[PDB]
Amino acid sequence: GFIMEFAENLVLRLMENPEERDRKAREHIYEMHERCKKIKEMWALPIRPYGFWTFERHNAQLRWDPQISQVAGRRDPYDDLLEDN
Amino acid sequence: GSPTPVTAFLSIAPKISIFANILRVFIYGSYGATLQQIFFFCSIASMILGALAAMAQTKVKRLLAYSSIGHVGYICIGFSCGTIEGIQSLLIGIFIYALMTMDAFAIVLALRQTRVKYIADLGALAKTNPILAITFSITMFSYAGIPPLAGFCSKFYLFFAALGCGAYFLALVGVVTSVIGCFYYIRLVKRMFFDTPRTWILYEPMDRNKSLLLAMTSFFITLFLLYPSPLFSVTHQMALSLYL
């Protein structure tokens, strides 16, 4: 053929779907705003959590001392006296 | 006074461990909120005095010392704002400052082969060894906080943490101290690219280990902003692991 009859549909192939572009734009806005709200919530967390000491890793002694309160140097004076019988 | 390799080990290895120690003490042993005040004023003073004192120094090691003091103030900004983002900014700043300090001391050790003492001896270094000159200029800019480099990200997120807690005076003093801090860094730049002294000092070539470390750190500094996700995620996990 001639030049323009091919350059026309060439440019038309080069250009994209606008419906896809609009859908992607509204989508991206939706999830970006949702993620923005999520990050805003995340930044509100205090440095020290409400539980803190309640956490099992932050006790480390309520389940260690009971198995140590029997060794010498930690016993209540009234433990060795009546342990004989 | 201390030997160059000793100072290289100092200000990186001790400061990291001491800062982790201070984090452990501050988070747990401090609930009266009275360490905010002691960190606030001292970090402000460190910022101001490092920025105002490093500009008056003519040697290299003194300049690195005062730059270290200034960066210590910048990092200590994170203690005043006690939040997850504050500790994250503090740790990121420590990491970036450690990398930049390693690179800068690699530069200093490289020119130590011919006993570099002052700042004027590294004159016209872009002619004898242009690539080392470029590396040193990039590292100096990273110290300055120029955007297209690492070191700007650390200062950025430190400022973000400072503004998160409402310490608006911390942000302003950080900005002004950065403005003065960049000035003498660029002053270091002029004597090393632009003006050529009459007498030139010739430096013998480097060795492979220092060159490899320097190249790795230089590529880390420039290309950090392209892919900074792993550092941020490490730091966010580390900040939260203090409690859970």
Query: Following DSSP, what letter does each residue of B196-224 receive, concatenated?
Result: --SS--------HHHHHHHHHHHHHHHHG
**B17 Cα to chain A: minimum distance (Å):** 21
**Closest Cα to residue B79, out of B34, B131, B40?**
B40
B84/A47 Cβ within 8 A: yes
What's CA B190's distance to the chain center, in Å? 20
- Ordered alpha helix ranges (H), A1-85: 3-14, 18-42
Cα–Cα distance for residue pair B74/B170, rounded to 1 Å: 10
Amino acid at A39: I
Amino acid at A22: D
A35 CB-near residues (< 8 Å, 6+ apart): none
Residue B11 DSSP SS3:
coil
Contact residues on chain B for A58, CB-CB shorter than 8 A: 243
Q: How was this structure determined?
A: cryo-EM
The two tokens of residue B241 are 């692991």
Q: Which residue in A has a C-alpha nearest to residue B30's C-alpha?
A: A48
In angstroms, this model's resolution equals: 3.7
Contact residues on chain A for B27, CB-CB shorter than 8 A: 47-48
Helix H or strand E segment including B61: helix B61-80
**A55 Cα to chain B: minimum distance (Å):** 8
What residues of A are in the B interface, CB distance below 8 Å? 43, 45-49, 52, 55, 57-58
Burial (Cβ within 10 Å: 0-12, 13-18, ≥19) of residue B153? buried
Cα–Cα distance for residue pair B98/B177, rounded to 1 Å: 20
**A46 Cα to chain B: minimum distance (Å):** 6
Contact residues on chain A for B243, CB-CB shorter than 8 A: 48-49, 52, 55, 58
